[PDB]
């Protein structure tokens, strides 16, 4: 199918969001993204900076395939709104939510 990519990414975010016993990614902070078009890349450009957190390894891998181009830490093409950082666990809840929205709206990339 076409929605499979989105289907499984969402499952993942749902996992590390119910399955976070202790604060996700040691309470690390990440740049918040404008949740709109060209945000798959904004999302990866943001989290890519959390090195040392495995709980988010998958998530980041999954993101890389949604993003046309490769993303390196400290690189910010898609991420224009870079004036606020939020804790990672909020970032994924916010991200997660926005995804569900795109799914409902039948938007898969």
């Amino acid at each position: 199918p076409p929605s499979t990519a989105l289907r499984e990414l969402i499952e993942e975010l749902v996992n590390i969001t119910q399955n976070q016993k202790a604060p996700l990614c040691n309470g690390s902070m990440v740049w918040s993204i404008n949740l709109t078009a060209g945000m798959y890349c904004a999302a990866l450009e943001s989290l890519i900076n959390v090195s040392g957190c495995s709980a988010i390894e998958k998530t980041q891998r999954m993101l890389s395939g949604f993003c046309p181009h490769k993303v390196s830490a400290g690189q910010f093409s898609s991420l224009h709104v870079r004036d606020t950082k939020i804790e990672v666990a909020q970032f994924v809840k916010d991200l997660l939510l926005h995804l569900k929205k795109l799914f409902r709206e039948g938007r898969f990339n």
């Binding site: 929605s3 989105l6 289907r7 969402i10 749902v14 309470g27 902070m29 004036d83 606020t84 950082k85 939020i86 804790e87 909020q90 939510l97 926005h98 569900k100 929205k101 799914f103 409902r104 039948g106």
Partner: protein, 252 residues
């Protein structure tokens, strides 16, 4: 050393729970502010760092809000270690009128078929309901109430209302009730229709709801996300929402 931000204040635009926190730069590269905040009663602090002079978020207006912020200097600024200022503090808390339990009870909402919102409650003179979400210029009041005094509300069409915080205040004249939730999570759909035998099939009810957003339950009990394999019932799945109400069952 550095000084804390000035004019640290929590502002109520009056959006029924959506609040601004504001401050002015302190005195004396780029400067950061670490803002912590929470509803009083929460044991955890919501944290964020910004270069802006304001932040915004949804709060429980039933409860009090407390916040602390401190200027944050990057070591590039210092060219030494990371300097930080002392906490500025502020609070904000709706002047409570009337005696609680004069505040209305049993507040219940459903977003029938992702289409029509209904809200109901028992009292403890008359009640008013207002609501707001981003997009709205200001908080609106219900028009088509459910009288019996008002004990219900039947909402207008809520365009672009799901997948964002939805605020409700139930005034009176006494203690106002505040409620927040997101519509996609409160949907009771319509039962599936056109059940047929051929593995047995059936189809999507009449609604704005896509099929991908449905989970089906089947008591002939069992659960499934396809429409095949009698009576069937539905509910929005966790690819579209976080929680949900089951539709009523269909006909045999």
């Amino acid at each position: 050393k550095v000084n804390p931000p000035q004019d640290f204040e929590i502002v109520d635009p009056g959006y029924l729970g959506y609040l601004y926190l504001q401050w002015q730069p302190p005195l004396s590269c780029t400067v950061e502010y670490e803002l912590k905040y929470r509803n009083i009663g929460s044991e955890t602090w919501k944290t964020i760092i910004t270069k802006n002079l304001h932040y915004k978020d949804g709060f429980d207006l039933n409860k009090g809000i407390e916040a602390k912020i401190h200027t944050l200097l990057p070591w590039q600024c210092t060219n030494g270690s990371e300097v930080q200022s002392s906490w500025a503090e502020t609070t904000y808390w709706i002047s409570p009128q009337g005696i609680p339990e004069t505040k209305v009870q049993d507040m219940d909402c459903v977003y029938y078929n992702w289409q029509y919102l209904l809200c109901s409650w028992k009292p403890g003179t008359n009640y008013n309901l207002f609501y707001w979400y981003e997009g709205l210029d200001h908080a609106l009041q219900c028009v088509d109430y459910i009288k019996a005094q008002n004990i219900g509300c039947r909402f207008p069409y809520l365009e672009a209302s799901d997948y964002k915080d939805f605020y409700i205040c139930v005034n009176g004249s006494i203690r106002s009730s505040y409620f927040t939730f997101q519509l996609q999570n409160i949907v009771k759909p319509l039962p599936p229709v056109y059940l047929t035998f051929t593995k047995l099939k059936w189809s999507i009810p009449l609604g704005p709801i896509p099929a991908r957003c449905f989970d089906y339950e089947i008591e002939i009990t069992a659960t499934v996300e396809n429409e095949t394999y009698f009576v069937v019932r539905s509910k929005v799945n966790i690819y579209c929402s976080d929680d949900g109400i089951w539709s009523e069952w269909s006909d045999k």
